[PDB]
Design a binder for this molecule. Structure first.
Ligand SMILES: [Zn+2]
Ligand SMILES: [Zn+2]
Ligand SMILES: [Zn+2]
Ligand SMILES: [Zn+2]
Lengths: 82, 84
């Protein structure tokens, strides 16, 4: 149950700041490194305000970083959560 | 716990340049590969100012500070210990 809680601690890092679900098409804020689903952060920047939902820095959709490995890490974490 | 699942994840969180665990992890905005701050800064000074992986123009400032990287590194360590 300790390997279990380590997995869960990692999974928590790779959850969307906005919807707190596991990340789909992860995007990372360049200024603070918080991760969001593409759709979530797109909707935020587009319907809420042009700033990072966590760090509040000005932010346009195109400054967002594609976290290319996120989907693999996320799938692996799924495998681990038996 | 699948050993290779864990190892796959650990590969992601090794420094592309020195292969060790990340120290003050930075991420290349263009390909999102991770490097120790010190390693990538040396690289950019010594080698062409290109990501050692994306090979794309990369300067010190475009570098993303991965604030959660240490946390993950620490947990990975515990996971790897759990070979027992
Ligand atoms: Zn931010
Ligand atoms: Zn989301
Ligand atoms: Zn390094
Ligand atoms: Zn790169």
């Amino acid at each position: 149950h300790m390997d279990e809680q380590s997995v869960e601690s990692i999974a928590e890092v790779f959850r969307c700041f906005i919807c707190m679900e596991k990340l789909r098409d992860a995007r990372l804020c360049p200024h603070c490194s918080k991760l969001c689903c593409f759709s979530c952060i797109r909707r935020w920047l587009t319907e809420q305000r042009a700033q990072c939902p966590h760090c509040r820095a000005p932010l346009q959709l195109r400054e967002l970083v594609n976290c290319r490995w996120a989907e693999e890490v996320t799938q692996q974490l799924d495998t681990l959560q038996l």
